[PDB]
Amino acid sequence: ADLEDNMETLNDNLKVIEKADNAAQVKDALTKMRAAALDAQKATPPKLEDKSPDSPEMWHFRHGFDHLVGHIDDALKLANEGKVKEAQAAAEQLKCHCNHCHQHYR
Template identity: 40%
Template sequence: ADLEGDMLSLSAGLSTVLSSDQASEMQQALTQMRDAAKDAKTATPPSLAGSSPQSPAMQGWRDAFDQLIAKVNQAEQQVKLGKLAEAKQTAQQIAALRNQNHRKYR
């Protein structure tokens, strides 16, 4: 998907993780979020158009998605252990990461 499509997938997945009480549904949403984050990591946002892949700005872009993926993995482990409330707290940290990065790149 293009970056906008990846962002819409992240958004739908995050809403599901925050609102669901079913482990299987949360797991599926987290998988969708990880796939979207991996794809978005390879994109260049309009705000960095023309930046070289090795520029500090593009490295920061990719690091942000690695942080997002690490949080998705953490939430997934929590779901697997049946710790759904903890997984939702991790999802809140993902929302904070989103807000920080939107201020930088959007």
């Protein structure tokens, strides 16, 4: 899986969560999102292609996924406790971090 594949996993599983009817369904999608986020974190995006791998921009790109995973982990906490509505609200917090990374790096 390359960066664009991971991004499709992220987008698709956001829909699953929004449509979910129980917290286990939210947990399964969040689990897939966690794996796609850590895979994506290893990639170099086209826009940063001609910068150093140790560049500040690349570290800021990679840290964006750390914060996304932190939010995914926080929602997994709620999902694993049967709190489907609260886990769905927690997953809604991801959207702004999707947007903020894209603004700078997509």
